[PDB]
Amino acid sequence: REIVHIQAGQCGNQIGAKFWEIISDEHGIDATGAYHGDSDLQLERINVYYNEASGGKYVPRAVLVDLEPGTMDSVRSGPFGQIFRPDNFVFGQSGAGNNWAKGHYTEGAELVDSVLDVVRKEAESCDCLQGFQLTHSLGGGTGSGMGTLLISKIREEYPDRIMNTYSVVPSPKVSDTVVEPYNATLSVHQLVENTDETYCIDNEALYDICFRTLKLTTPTYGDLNHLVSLTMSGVTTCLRFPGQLNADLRKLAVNMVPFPRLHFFMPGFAPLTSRGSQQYRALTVPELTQQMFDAKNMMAACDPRHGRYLTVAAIFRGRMSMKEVDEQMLNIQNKNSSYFVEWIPNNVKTAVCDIPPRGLKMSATFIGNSTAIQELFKRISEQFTAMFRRKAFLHWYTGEGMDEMEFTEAESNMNDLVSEYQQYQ
Template sequence: MPSRPSQVAGTCPALCWWIWSRAPWTLRSGPFGQIFRPDSFIFGQSGAGNNWARGHYTEGAELMESVMDVVRKEAESCDCLQGFQLTHSLGGGTGSGMGTLLLSKIREEYPDRITNTFSILPSPKVSDTVVEPYNATLSVHQLIENADETFCIDNEALYDICSRTLKLPTPTYGDLNHLVSATMSGVTTCLRFPGQLNADLRKLAVNMVPFPRLHFFMPGFAPLTSRGSQQYRFLTVAELAQQMSDAGNMMAACDPRHGRYLTAAAIFRGRMPMREVDEQMFNIQNKNSSYFADWLPHNVKTAVCDIPPRGLKMSATFIGNNTAIQELFKRVSEQFTAMFRRKAFLHWYTGEGMDEMEFTEAESNMNDLFLSIDSIRMPQPRRRRRRGLELSFSR
């Protein structure tokens, strides 16, 4: 979606598409249905059947020209197009297959614009289908090549937050989506409200992505509250700073203490003194200096927005580019490998025109990502000073 607000009051410059025809009516008849323009809804007559190949090559490909027409219309209405934001799931067929197809088309047509994705990775704890590892691995293969920034939101982490932190006995998709929406609102704060840090998508990428392939972020949020109880939760700046970077508050199921932060950003919302925020962030960096890459100076950025989120007086959102993100991908990769070695369920994909080589390429690309991360995690050897005669010449 275009990153600048639409000039038409009461409408949202967003594109919503489905291959399954019944899904959009659920949204349009709900409380948020009036936010989106009717001509921004695109849907087909049959589903992707949780099959990445159907979303990417057959059913999704048939709708792609209609989707791109709406994208072009939205892009033309922008005075200054920064880029596109895509929200999708990697476990099913439409969000993974058609979502990555749309991403590649946008990259092809708008190569100089930033592409930013909020990608929901699957988990056995909240699972709809057994082929989720296939769909997720094929999608990550595309995200590595075609996305500039990817915020990894993990169903396993969301489920753990709901059950352990919020003490919800049976978390629903509404509870999980509440956490996702709070995180997305915090991440996009600087895009929607006045501020100096990460004021557009490109500045965010420049601050957060030291290497092109390592653009996968783990977001965190504080305070964590269940739906309807936000008004009863109040934290100090020190507590917000401590909680937002805690492993239990991360929206990705990986422990940042198992890796190192290449870059990080913290966005505080609400009325609070900037000096106190800077002091707390300085204390956190000093206390956890071993978890930050020492060869990247000034790699933690902080911003404060006076406008708090709805229902809260203060909040904090954390964005971390941490090498521990590979734990999340390795969990998916191990499941992928176990199935692919036995060719399980592969006929559903080859029947849609895919080749086994595409699976091999996706697996290889993810393994290359692990190698790239490991090469950065390893401490750089100190260069030995050469012994011997040194000659200096002067005129």
């Protein structure tokens, strides 16, 4: 059970750069592939992201993508940049210029062969794998254009496995590009069918968490990428360390995705405390659980209180007590009986791992599938209906041959998706 890594676009790299910086510290690997750890538990399941090389060195199972050469120099020269194998850096030379049309048709058609040759190499090397995970942003041109293409090609080759995407969906309050709505609409037409587990993140809410809860005065992209990577590292703890109760990727998908189309999640992490207020807290499970479900700490631009949770999952880390976890699960459910779907008794999935995060006693991750995602989509599409109606900017995309059926199909199926969430709320 090991899983290969794909990461695309300019945005995907800084999200991808911090992941390999954090996870090397978790597993004891130095910046040059050496090992200096203490627990033998690090080496028990090391091959999940790493593969063995000569001389007692490990290099990651990373397949790195780009379409412009500028971002390559930064990642190569940065901290923990020499870990990657040089062949893995696959990048073009021209650029996308914030287009979905160029990212799928014109420039993605040529560079796609190079990456699929590498990902085919990573698949045969591993003995028995389960999934691929991809990190990208849903507002740009390369990440949306190339990311949607690879997902299509990968799915047809391996229909029997699980697939992961950790997307960033844009928000109007933090809007940055005049053509954002065209990018976000054209992509989601395919993630509705060609991925099994999808996580949505807003750059707007990341600013709320760093301002209010964490008391950060200068949120740079150094800090925002820190928050997301801790969520990715948390989902795959059961794959790498033992525990009283275990839950891997296939265990979550079956238990918490109720219907095939309803796979859009909301992250959430706890504890998140400031460096000055950390001396004024306890160390106990109750304080962790009450923080997960907080509408003020969830990691997207949605208030769950506008709807009712379908299913959730809470993943805990540290030496813990098994009553103190499940007993408090019912305290939330009965005391808050209004916010949970009535015809799904005991909506909560549970898991406990043993090895805690370094420097801490306890932590936890919340993955709650809610019906409040139905508001994220009309909020974006309303942006799009105000522009496409008057055919603004449309000539730039039409030069590559798309037809207005493509937009209507994009609009119709997104209405089809929005419809599916309302009745089952």
